[PDB]
C-alpha cells in the first residue's frame, strides 16, 4: 500500500517506481500492490548493483564508498529504472560493441564482467514457479535469470551465482524485513495474493 511504500523505500526508488508506473495508467492510489512490487524489484536491482566494481586487474570487488573513478569501472549497467529511451540506447549500444543479439525484452541489468544480460524477479510465491514462468518467456535469448523470494529462498540460471554471497545475503534479508513489516502492518496477505 502507498503509505507503506512511501514509508519503507528511499526517495530515489520511489521516484523511479512512480515514474515507470505512470506509463500503464496505473497509480500508487488504486494500485498500491503494483507500486510495492515495482519498488521492491527496483530496490533489489540497486542492491544487486551498488558497490560492485571491476579492478584494473579485471577482478570483481565490493567497495563501500561507491563513486566510479578511472581505476574502478562499475560492474553493472543498471537498465531497470531508466527511461525506456535511455534503456534501449544502452542495450542497443552494448549489443553493438559485442555479439550479444538485441533482446526482445528490456533486461534489469548488464554485467560487464561476464557480458550477460540479467533479468531479476522477486516473488511472494515459490521461486521454482516464478523461475520457470520467466525462463519460459525468455527462452532462447540467453539472459541470466535470478529470482528472489520473501521467504529468503533464491534461484538462478543453472544454479551459479555471479553475485557475491554477501550481497545475496543482504538482499534476502531486506526482502525478509519487508515481509515482516508488511505483516505487522496487516498488508502482507493482500499483497502475497495480488501476484499475477
Q: Please give the residue ranges that form the binding site for Mn ion (CB under 5 A).
A: 108, 120
Nearest CB to Mn ion, comparing residues 55 and 83: 83
Distances 96 to 92, 149, 187 between C-alpha atoms, Å: 6, 34, 45
Which CB atom, from 1 or from 106, has the smaller least distance to Mn ion? 106
In the residue annotation, 80 being an active-site residue is answered as: yes
Q: In 3D, which of 186, 180, 120 has the Cα closest to residue 150?
A: 180
Backbone angles phi, psi at 20, to 5 degrees: -55, -25
In degrees rounded to 5, what are phi and psi of residue 14?
-60, -45
Contact 127, 154 (CB under 8 A): yes
41 has binding-site annotation: yes
Q: Which of 23, 26, 31, 80 is catalytic?
A: 80
Among the listed residues 77, 108, 111, 154, the single catalytic one is 108
Q: Is 68 a catalytic residue?
A: no
Q: Strand, helix or coil at 48? A: helix
- Closest distance of CB 134 from Mn ion, Å: 8
146 is in an annotated binding site: no
78 forms beta bridges with 109
CB-nearer residue toward Mn ion: 43 or 108: 108
For residue 79, the minimal CB distance to Mn ion (Å) is 10
CB closer to Mn ion out of 47 and 120: 120
Closest distance of CB 44 from Mn ion, Å: 9
162 is in an annotated binding site: no
Does 38 appear as a known binding residue? no
Helix, strand, coil abundance in the chain, percent, nearest 5: 45, 15, 40
Residues assigned a catalytic role: 80, 108
Amino acid at each position: 500500500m502507498e503509505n507503506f511504500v512511501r514509508t519503507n523505500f528511499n526517495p530515489m526508488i520511489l521516484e523511479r517506481a512512480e515514474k515507470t508506473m505512470k506509463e500503464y495508467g496505473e497509480n500508487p492510489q488504486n494500485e498500491g500492490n503494483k507500486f510495492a512490487a515495482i519498488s521492491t524489484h527496483m530496490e533489489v536491482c540497486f542492491m544487486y548493483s551498488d558497490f560492485h566494481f571491476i579492478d584494473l586487474e579485471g577482478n570483481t570487488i565490493v567497495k563501500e564508498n561507491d563513486d566510479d573513478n578511472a581505476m574502478l569501472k562499475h560492474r553493472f549497467e543498471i537498465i531497470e529504472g531508466q527511461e525506456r529511451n535511455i534503456a534501449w540506447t544502452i542495450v542497443n549500444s552494448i549489443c553493438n560493441m559485442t555479439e550479444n543479439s538485441k533482446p526482445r525484452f528490456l533486461p534489469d541489468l548488464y554485467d560487464y564482467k561476464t557480458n550477460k544480460f540479467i533479468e531479476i524477479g522477486v516473488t511472494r510465491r515459490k521461486v521454482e514457479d516464478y523461475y520457470y514462468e520467466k525462463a519460459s518467456k525468455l527462452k532462447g535469448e540467453n539472459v541470466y535469470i535470478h529470482i528472489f523470494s520473501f521467504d529468503g529462498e533464491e534461484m538462478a540460471t543453472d544454479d551459479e551465482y555471479i553475485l557475491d554471497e554477501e550481497s545475496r545475503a543482504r538482499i534476502k534479508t531486506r526482502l525478509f524485513v519487508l515481509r515482516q513489516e508488511l505483516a505487522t502492518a496487516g498488508l502482507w496477505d493482500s499483497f502475497r495474493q495480488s501476484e499475477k
